Amino acid sequence: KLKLSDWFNPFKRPEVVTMTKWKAPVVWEGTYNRAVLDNYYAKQKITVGLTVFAVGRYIEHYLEEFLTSANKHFMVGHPVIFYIMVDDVSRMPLIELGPLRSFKVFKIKPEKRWQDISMMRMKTIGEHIVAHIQHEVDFLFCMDVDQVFQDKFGVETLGESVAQLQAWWYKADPNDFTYERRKESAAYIPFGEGDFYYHAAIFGGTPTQVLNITQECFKGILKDKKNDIEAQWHDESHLNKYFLLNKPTKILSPEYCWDYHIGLPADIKLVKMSWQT
Numbered sequence: 001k002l003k004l005s006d007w008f009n010p011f012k013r014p015e016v017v018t019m020t021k022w023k024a025p026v027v028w029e030g031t032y033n034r035a036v037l038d039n040y041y042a043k044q045k046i047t048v049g050l051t052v053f054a055v056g057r058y059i060e061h062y063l064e065e066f067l068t069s070a071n072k073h074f075m076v077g078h079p080v081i082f083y084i085m086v087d088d089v090s091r092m093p094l095i096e097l098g099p100l101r102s103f104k105v106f107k108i109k110p111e112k113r114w115q116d117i118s119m120m121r122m123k124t125i126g127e128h129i130v131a132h133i134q135h136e137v138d139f140l141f142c143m144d145v146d147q148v149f150q151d152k153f154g155v156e157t158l159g160e161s162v163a164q165l166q167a168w169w170y171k172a173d174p175n176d177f178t179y180e181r182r183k184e185s186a187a188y189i190p191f192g193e194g195d196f197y198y199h200a201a202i203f204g205g206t207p208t209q210v211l212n213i214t215q216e217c218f219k220g221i222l223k224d225k226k227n228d229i230e231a232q233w234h235d236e237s238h239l240n241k242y243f244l245l246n247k248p249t250k251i252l253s254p255e256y257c258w259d260y261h262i263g264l265p266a267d268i269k270l271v272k273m274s275w276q277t
């Protein structure tokens, strides 16, 4: 079966972190052999899911560019199912999908407050995993709609649980991470603890693992809400708590979710997905 040495060469990028202390790969441009992996997973006939939520004007502002870029760049050569969650189905753009892509659309109940928006999104993802996604795909990613694929975002990103390094903080010391710091919050992390600052705009894994991520995050949000507290960065704070306790088996570099407002440092060799404008 697939071994890490079959496809991952950390020595191609010695100026960055490529392996965690728990021996998870951090995937940077140049460290991965996509050809080897494409052939391995083709033989296995895997399908990959992608969930995206879009409410109100986010539909018109972002959803078409997201879908158009994902069709062009996400897991090319492998079956993909787009799970599109919107509040108004009559407003959603119908994009032409390429070979091995298809979609499903669901009408959801929008929530007014950011706390309740993220709360219901983690709950909704878990419900869909149990109802159907666990039957439909081998790997599932959950992404924010307000970003754009720029280049191939492929099977090198698959794993049991996949976290994204947040672009502004990947070089920072953990003491400075914008973790939730009040012990009243379920997302509490003490100063000095933590491995990375993960970005809630991309995460994934097998459907089983993603069910656990979302169920734990939802419980923590709920627990905070019953105590009249709102984590500093809402689901992202709880996600960071979760991945501290349940280490990801693979991490993606900021090449996979890059904010061009930062600039283009030497570390960022080829951008696969960028924050919207």
Ligand SMILES: OC[C@H]1O[C@@H](O[C@H]2[C@H](O)[C@@H](O)[C@H](O)O[C@@H]2CO)[C@H](O)[C@@H](O)[C@H]1O
Residues within 6 Å of the ligand: 166, 168, 178, 199, 200, 233, 236
């Ligand atoms: O800190 C979590 C929070 O980061 C925001 O991104 C910020 C970044 O944290 C800040 O240091 C920099 O000065 O500006 C960035 C945006 O302009 C994200 O926008 C937010 O989603 C969280 O991930």
